[PDB]
Design a protein around this ligand. Structure first.
Ligand code: NCA
Length: 208
């Protein structure tokens, strides 16, 4: 299976904007998505902490989460696509927070081997929503960990960039409680980054 990889910002925006125009999101769904782009770290943090159980959340956050979940009934990718993220060391676990990079700003080889043993050829379940970009955009592309997600035609995925509170992110949102498989992990040419290739399986949250 081949996955569409956008190579040009204008081409990516054109395609994304075309997708967004057809979603027919409701007023309430749009409000929930706007708020997500302002408060994603709080929302995803609480989802991770509680392993996806939202019963104890404030009433307004339950409503927001259920609206985001339901919005994916309208938001699917029309083709196999590649999506991107940049992550900081803690993404690999607490043990990598202050050990992944050496004093030169280069990936420590012992940490890289430990990360490979931990994640290579394994599944990973994410309790939060996954914010991605259509390309490796500048804002996040200098982070030490770059992930390329292979997302199959028909999968829940939404270009929310047109109503995001923030610019330059080419943001495609993926549903919460998604599982992906780490296929490949290697250092970059200059040794400053870990490039991860993963295959998106899909989400366990499927209302309606
Ligand atoms: N960390 C990221 O790559 C990212 C992508 C899109 C929106 N927000 C964050």
């Amino acid at each position: 299976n081949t996955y569409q990889e956008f190579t040009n910002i204008d081409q990516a925006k054109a395609w994304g904007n075309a997708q967004y125009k057809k979603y027919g999101l409701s007023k309430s769904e749009k409000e929930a998505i706007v708020s997500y782009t302002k408060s994603a770290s709080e929302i995803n943090g609480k989802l991770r902490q509680n392993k996806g159980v939202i019963n104890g959340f404030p009433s307004n956050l339950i409503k927001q989460v259920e609206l985001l979940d339901k919005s994916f009934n309208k938001m699917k990718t029309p083709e196999n696509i590649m999506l991107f993220r940049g992550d900081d060391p803690a993404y690999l676990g607490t043990e990598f927070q202050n050990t992944l990079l050496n004093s030169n700003g280069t990936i420590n080889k012992t940490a890289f081997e430990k990360a490979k043993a931990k994640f290579l050829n394994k599944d990973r379940l994410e309790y939060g929503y996954i914010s991605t970009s259509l390309m490796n955009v500048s804002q996040f592309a200098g982070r030490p960990i770059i992930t390329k997600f292979k997302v199959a035609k028909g999968s829940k995925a939404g270009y929310i960039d047109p109503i995001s509170a923030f610019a330059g992110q080419l943001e495609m949102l993926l549903p919460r409680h998604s599982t992906y498989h780490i296929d490949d992990m290697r250092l970059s040419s200059d040794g400053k980054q870990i490039i991860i290739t993963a295959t998106m399986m899909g989400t366990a949250i499927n209302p309606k």
